[PDB]
Amino acid sequence: EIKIADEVKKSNKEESKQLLEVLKTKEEHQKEVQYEILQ
Amino acid sequence: YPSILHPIDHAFNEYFLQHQLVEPLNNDIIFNYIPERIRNDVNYILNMDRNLPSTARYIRPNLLQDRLNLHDNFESLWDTITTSNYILARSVVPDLKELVSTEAQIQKMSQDLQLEALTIQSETQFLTGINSQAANDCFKTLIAAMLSQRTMSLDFVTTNYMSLISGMWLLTVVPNDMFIRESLVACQLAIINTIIYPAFGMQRMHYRNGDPQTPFQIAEQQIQNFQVANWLHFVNNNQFRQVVIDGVLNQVLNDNIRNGHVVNQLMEALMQLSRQQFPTMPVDYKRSIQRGILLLSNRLGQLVDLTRLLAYNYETLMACITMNMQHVQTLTTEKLQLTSVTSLCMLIGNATVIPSPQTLFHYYNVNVNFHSNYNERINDAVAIITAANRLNLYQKKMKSIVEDFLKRLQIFDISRVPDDQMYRLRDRLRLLPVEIRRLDIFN
Amino acid sequence: LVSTEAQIQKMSQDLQLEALTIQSETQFLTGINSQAANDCFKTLIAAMLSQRTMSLDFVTTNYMSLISGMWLLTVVPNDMFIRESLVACQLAIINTIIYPAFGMQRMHYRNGDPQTPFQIAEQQIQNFQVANWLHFVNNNQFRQVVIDGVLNQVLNDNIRNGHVVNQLMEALMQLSRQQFPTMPVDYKRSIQRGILLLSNRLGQLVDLTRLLAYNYETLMACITMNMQHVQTLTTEKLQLTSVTSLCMLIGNATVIPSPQTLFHYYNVNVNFHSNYNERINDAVAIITAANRLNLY
Amino acid sequence: QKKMKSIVEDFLKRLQIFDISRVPDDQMYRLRDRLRLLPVEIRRLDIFN
Amino acid sequence: PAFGMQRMHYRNGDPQTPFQIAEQQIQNFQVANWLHFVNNNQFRQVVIDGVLNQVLNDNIRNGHVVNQLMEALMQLSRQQFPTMPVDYKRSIQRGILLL
């Protein structure tokens, strides 16, 4: 999950759907930096 | 009525007739039972139906202040007697209604921060831990800790520049002699080395622990801007003011915190930190600390209305206490997350909540029932500690009559209190005078 | 009466309760009824023929039950209500409607005071239409008089004429033109239209108090016992929510007591008063005769 | 002995936009106090005299 | 925010609208002329052929009102301001160009 507040996750808007996708491709970039150091 | 009584018997029975604990009851003495800072308040309208006759009587309780001084060298008994007041003062303070909705606030907080989906930056963690439930919790543990004088303890992460900017609002409103000093200094040092010393370009302070001065007391001497040295002087000299009102000594706030004029002295300080260039810092550090200082500076209308609301719900609930409130650092500190302070300053708007009078007469009736029980278990034990010395009972030990005094007070436990704290508590119960209804029944 | 489905549907349009910030939106118009207008016409007369104290029950949030409390004080005399409920109504009228209108400070009032709040703001206010209505409501009581043997508390000549409501209309119309200089514009515009629901009902409110003071006057003729006035212990609770249901539900249909009704309220009062004096004369004549015969 | 509610109720009903069920008896007897002070038309005044 | 001064402290129920109180604070010339026109924008009541009907001004009819507004938006798009970040400046300056 994202652990943002529950009225943003289950909401169906346009300004609140993009906020979940931007916080989802910050995790995949922060896990991409931590994985490259470990190799 | 006639009798047949022994002259020893008549001396006892005459004493029960003259010394009765009843006093006449009227309409002007029911309204004088309400405290003076409520029946003079212009927000509450007081009305009654029946008028009592000339016959009716009532028994007055004895609310006289603490004669044992349990806040003086009794440091484990005072911690139970001030945790008990903190849970009671938390279920009385009202909860906020008609808040700004959470979804319409993070959508506005995400467009002011301008957060990008590819670079990892420090403006993502400004969004953590805000919701409608933790905004309702910071409001309670600020009012309920002040009425019970529980020591607070800040909890935060130093990689979050929004719990540090909204942490400049706690220290300018809540007095600094209330947070525990191992956590007040570790938060003032995070504000100094991040927000304000990089904003003017000087070298960040190398602070060793154990110094006699907090880092806000040592930085107003070093800094040379004017409008950020007026705020940094109000934080240092913020104290409660001990005044005795209506018999009980209670600690009032400042005269600027009640007005909300402190925030207008704060929003000139951090309106100037966002105007300076950051000379030794890179450009992405000037921008990521000027956006977090802007989410607080658009709430200048809503933060003057928030300081006026904490300072009013603390004034009305302070009139409903009867026991003397003392200012002593307690053992166990009640935690306060600094993320829920951020969740309060940018979620409240345009809805005054004041405590209902059906919970002011219930918070008052518990504070009289505990105080009139604590003061009538002293007199039940002083009049036997003294009566077992006038009668010369040299073989008796007085543990079993202090053990029934801690037990009949309902809030204490006996399996925790050792024997050292009981034969020393009766060193204080011996010097007190016997109440005058128990002295003539012993003579 | 006026039809209760046409008044509330019009009264909910002038107040505009949905657009405000009000917790009790569907609770302003609960007590308007056809069975509760007949109650405050019977409670107001029968607690005035038998000198019975009468407390007030109201909600200080609901300002429409407070404007109809201005008509209750200007007609019913001030010594009828219990003092703690007359002060608590006179304070809520000043501290919400009158003093926010003229821009004065909120009235700090202490409960141990000989002066009622309508006697303090009768001097500190600087209008003339409002300071002259506050002078009538301070100085209306029962004027004791002895008619045909018995004492009876009688109203003054200005209420039985119905002329006082022509002064209350002038004290309520000028209070509707006042700019409330700190009140929000949404809440000010709804307290100015709740006032004009009573200032525009002038012709059928003078016509009420000419009847409310005539049913009391023609029923007071058949009172054989003495009409003494003291403060009782228990009070008959009058609800200011249902006084609103009387001032704006009355019509042009006058009712007078029937002569068979008026001769039955007389014959109950003579049969009880002559029985009260035929037991005193029988309880004295035994208590005295037991003492002459030396009966310990 | 006549009461003038029934001819102001017919005056609103003869216009088309107003409805009768939302107008109480306050707003219908207050309206005839403005209909008395008006002068009657010269065709109706000469046929009443 | 376009001139860098502190945002106004407005409470409800005040007798002055915020455009009647910002023409006293702003000492620019081309944008204090536009606030003076907005505050004095009223209907003019004339009677014509017996019928009282309300006329607009002679500048709203001409269209010369917009030549006072677009002289105030053009100067407000050029003012740089220090208390706000750079991207908040660039987003107001883009929406003012669509007009």
Residue numbers in the entry:
A (entry chain K): 61 to 99
B (entry chain I): 248 to 690
C (entry chain H): 346 to 641
D (entry chain G): 642 to 690
E (entry chain G): 445 to 543
Direct quotes from the study:
Here, we report the in situ near-atomic resolution structures of RdRp before and during transcription in rotavirus double layered particles (DLP). The RdRp has a conserved hand-shaped core domain (residues 333–778), which is sandwiched between an N-terminal domain (residues 1–332) and a C-terminal domain (residues 779–1088). This core domain can further be divided into the fingers, palm, and thumb subdomains, with the active site located between the fingers and palm. An atomic model was built based on this high-resolution in situ structure, with distinct side chain densities and RNA features. We determined that the RdRp is attached to CSP decamers at a specific, off-centered location, as previously described.
